[PDB]
Symmetry: C3
Subunit: 155 residues, 3 copies
Amino acid sequence: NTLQVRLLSENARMPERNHKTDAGYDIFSAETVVLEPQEKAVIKTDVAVSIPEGYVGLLTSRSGVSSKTHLVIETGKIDAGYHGNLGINIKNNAIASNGYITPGVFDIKGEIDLSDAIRQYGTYQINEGDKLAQLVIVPIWTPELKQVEEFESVF
Amino acid sequence: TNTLQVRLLSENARMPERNHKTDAGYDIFSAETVVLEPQEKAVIKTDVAVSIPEGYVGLLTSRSGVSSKTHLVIETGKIDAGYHGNLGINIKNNAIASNGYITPGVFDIKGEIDLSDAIRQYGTYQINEGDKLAQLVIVPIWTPELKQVEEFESVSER
Amino acid sequence: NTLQVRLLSENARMPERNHKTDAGYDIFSAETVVLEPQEKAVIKTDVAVSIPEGYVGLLTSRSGVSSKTHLVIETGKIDAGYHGNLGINIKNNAIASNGYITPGVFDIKGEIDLSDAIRQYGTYQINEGDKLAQLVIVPIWTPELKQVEEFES
Ligand SMILES: O=c1ccn([C@H]2C[C@H](O)[C@@H](COP(=O)(O)NP(=O)(O)OP(=O)(O)O)O2)c(=O)[nH]1
Ligand SMILES: O=c1ccn([C@H]2C[C@H](O)[C@@H](COP(=O)(O)NP(=O)(O)OP(=O)(O)O)O2)c(=O)[nH]1
Ligand SMILES: O=c1ccn([C@H]2C[C@H](O)[C@@H](COP(=O)(O)NP(=O)(O)OP(=O)(O)O)O2)c(=O)[nH]1
Ligand SMILES: [Mg+2]
Ligand SMILES: [Mg+2]
Ligand SMILES: [Mg+2]
């Protein structure tokens, strides 16, 4: 069995399962997005996948990025019927600077890069080609629902 | 197999929906109308019980639309097999303290503004009874016996 | 049908499957960590597991802790080939105190316990041995990727 991947642009990058021990496929950003404190965005990956029916994709966060930054990704559930552009549902959860601006910006590693503008402190800049998320595909059970008045089994 | 038993617990409850055979989960609806102000938490009653078979888990989780377009944050709940109680949606309005700013309207799960009966704080969401708020995705699980060891041995692939 | 578990210290505790009908294994903290508003930390469990290839661990939250407190755990993905100390990626999401301090601290149950110092309000204290998270293991599909110009059946 094989999983079809379709690159939707020149900025897209084939997801990578580097190590046979890895559970997921490394997902890359396909755009450069500046994300200020408390701001939400959907980072385009320019990647389409054709997941077979009987599975679900979990487009989810990386432990490193999650633990070292205020970038919060909401785990996306990829259906078999979705052949469109995979988006990373992200938010910069840092508190508003209320004024403090510095000539640098934070990256997904937590380190500081030189920036084109003097932007608010706690601003992250997601660069094109960044390992931003991972895709873990798991089998699903999708039976038919039967309404009963009582079950036949026993916070 | 190929059947999941569902119990509607009240007149406000609504049968979960698998719209498309291509969908991975079942859409879950709210069984109550809840006003939720900034930074407030609640557990939304669905008035729905399910009987998940042994060897599986339910993931009561968010919808991408609601999550991306609003400040409504659902913490993905893990529904165990043998759990026949009311499924609750673990929700929080993650909007910032609106200070004193109040408007005659409230936000819905779509992000749009509705006219309200009271003048509430800006960023207040109102979850309406019957709203498609979350989805239930059922996944198989591995629940082996645990063996404490001093050192790990290699293991064959699944 | 067995999973290898290694306890890495005296503070460690064997994960427990609560009713045996349950899907995950309750994980306990092996350390005492005081966590103030908006602070992030990785709570050591001092427990290693060897999950075989073809599975993923979901180190995720408990509904009680999650719904009753401001403690936010990001679900960690435990790969096969990770045989190290399992860490709980946690954050006290309580709002920045205005400067308010009380002689007590909040617990993972939401109740107030007396602490040795007068700390900021909304500060949580995770105690050694606290049932903090659970581990749910699910099978995974890791096929080979084939790039296409257009999708087929
Ligand atoms: O909360 C966590 C998350 C991950 N882990 C482990 C499991 C996983 O195998 C490893 C991190 O893997 P991820 O892919 O989730 N993040 P990252 O890509 O940053 O780590 P690495 O560079 O090693 O691949 O650390 C924990 O112990 N606790
Ligand atoms: O973050 C993402 C990115 C993409 N997607 C893709 C994959 C999925 O199949 C599709 C819709 O997923 P949801 O069911 O979570 N969105 P929603 O329920 O709000 O609307 P709809 O089901 O009508 O698309 O969009 C996400 O779900 N989350
Ligand atoms: O959001 C929800 C809604 C319902 N439930 C149900 C299903 C689950 O079987 C039951 C308990 O789930 P958890 O183990 O994750 N929470 P907790 O550990 O606090 O409760 P318990 O002591 O029963 O294990 O509550 C959730 O877990 N999360
Ligand atoms: Mg990784
Ligand atoms: Mg949907
Ligand atoms: Mg539990």
